[PDB]
Amino acid sequence: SLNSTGLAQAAINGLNARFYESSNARWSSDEPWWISGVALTMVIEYMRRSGSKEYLDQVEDVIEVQRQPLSWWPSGEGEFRADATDDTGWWALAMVRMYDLTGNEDYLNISIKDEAYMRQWWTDTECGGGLYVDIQDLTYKNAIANELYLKLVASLANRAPNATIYLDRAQQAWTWFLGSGMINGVNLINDGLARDSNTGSCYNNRLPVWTYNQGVILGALVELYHATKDESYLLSAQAIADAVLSPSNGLTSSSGVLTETCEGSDSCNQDQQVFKGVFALNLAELGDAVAGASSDPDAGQDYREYLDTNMQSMYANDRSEIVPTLFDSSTGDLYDVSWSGPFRNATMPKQASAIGLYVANI
Ligand SMILES: OC[C@H]1O[C@H](O[C@H]2[C@@H](O)[C@H](O)[C@@H](CO)O[C@@H]2O)[C@@H](O)[C@@H](O)[C@@H]1O
Ligand SMILES: OC[C@H]1O[C@H](O)[C@@H](O)[C@@H](O)[C@@H]1O
Numbered sequence: 001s002l003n004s005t006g007l008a009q010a011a012i013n014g015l016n017a018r019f020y021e022s023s024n025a026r027w028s029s030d031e032p033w034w035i036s037g038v039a040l041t042m043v044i045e046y047m048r049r050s051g052s053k054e055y056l057d058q059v060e061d062v063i064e065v066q067r068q069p070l071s072w073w074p075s076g077e078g079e080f081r082a083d084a085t086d087d088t089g090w091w092a093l094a095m096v097r098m099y100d101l102t103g104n105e106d107y108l109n110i111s112i113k114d115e116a117y118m119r120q121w122w123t124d125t126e127c128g129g130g131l132y133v134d135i136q137d138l139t140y141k142n143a144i145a146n147e148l149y150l151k152l153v154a155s156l157a158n159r160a161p162n163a164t165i166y167l168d169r170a171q172q173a174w175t176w177f178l179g180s181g182m183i184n185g186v187n188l189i190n191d192g193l194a195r196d197s198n199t200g201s202c203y204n205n206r207l208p209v210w211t212y213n214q215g216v217i218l219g220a221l222v223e224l225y226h227a228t229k230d231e232s233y234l235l236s237a238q239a240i241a242d243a244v245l246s247p248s249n250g251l252t253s254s255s256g257v258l259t260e261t262c263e264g265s266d267s268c269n270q271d272q273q274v275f276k277g278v279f280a281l282n283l284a285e286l287g288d289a290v291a292g293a294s295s296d297p298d299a300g301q302d303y304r305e306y307l308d309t310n311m312q313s314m315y316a317n318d319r320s321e322i323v324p325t326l327f328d329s330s331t332g333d334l335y336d337v338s339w340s341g342p343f344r345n346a347t348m349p350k351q352a353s354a355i356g357l358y359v360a361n362i
Pocket of ligand 1 (some may be wrong): 272
């Protein structure tokens with residue numbers, strides 16, 4: 001009915017025409033640096049699922065420049081090692097995807113360097129495990145930094161030469177995450193952990209439920225299944241997904257459209273504008289593993305129909321075409337944050353989220 005591959009390329013062309021900076025090999029320097037790594041992930045995954053290699057040259061140029069020691073964190077010594085573990089995690093998983101697309105061991109070596117870098121802030125003395133997100137302060141063990149790390153060690157357990165240690169690290173990380181309390185009573189993941197003032201024990205801080213905190217964990221459990229052939233990991237991922245799928249949990253609208261919790265008040269900041277695309281791409285990873293792990297043709301079809309239903313709503317209601325000029329013949333599509341509301345503007349985080357949903361249906 002619809003060509004998700006064609007609309008994905010048009011969305012990537014719209015991302016490049018309005019937000020790419022050739023002089024810096026980066027999308028929107030006025031936006032967070034880690035979202036540029038998410039945009040790189042979506043472009044690499046587009047090329048992987050579609051078999052195309054249009055943006056290969058552009059993406060290697062981005063890596064070569066962003067590999068260098070960051071001006072705001074020279075102690076990281078480059079290779080995407082930043083002042084925050086989650087920032088490093090986004091780029092590390094992008095290198096895992098580039099290694100899957102090209103097979104170049106160079107990109108896998110970056111993810112290995114990033115794993116050892118992030119492990120430096122894993123402590124068993126607080127919360128019984130987990131790593132911090134604020135490297136400079138060490139005051140928060142949130143969900144995203146531990147979900148990105150868990151998916152990284154689980155991915156290296158399937159690709160790295162010394163994969164046994166990465167499997168043990170991933171198995172012990174999922175054990176800590178499941179026992180941390182971040183997964184609440186409805187199988188949704190709150191934002192992070194809080195520390196008791198007197199006892200020191202950690203507990204769910206009951207902070208907002210973000211869509212991207214229910215996606216990265218799915219890809220981690222998928223990789224944990226590919227490394228162990230244990231369908232128990234998928235069943236855990238299906239429970240988290242099914243909770244997001246249920247309209248009674250507030251994440252799925254009555255029309256069946258994914259809605260971030262800030263969309264109602266129109267207060268989604270620069271970070272939250274990209275959350276939805278991250279979940280969609282990871283949900284496609286979970287659906288692909290579920291359909292292959294069983295013989296039922298209807299396996300994972302609930303997840304495919306959801307991504308399809310969300311695509312048509314974003315197409316019909318959130319799309320906007322770039323105006324071609326007599327000097328600038330750049331064609332492409334632009335998208336806002338609400339996958340069902342109206343198009344009012346378009347920024348790079350919302351554009352990257354739109355690409356993720358199109359790629360999640362290829
Ligand atoms: O006051 C700091 C600010 O950041 C922390 O939230 C981070 C992350 O855990 C959240 O998922 C996203 C959501 O926008 O923002 C940060 O990256 C928390 O300490 C949060 O309470 C706070 O607003
Ligand atoms: O309250 C839980 C959590 O919320 C804050 O936003 C963070 O900065 C942490 O320091 C704290 O532990």
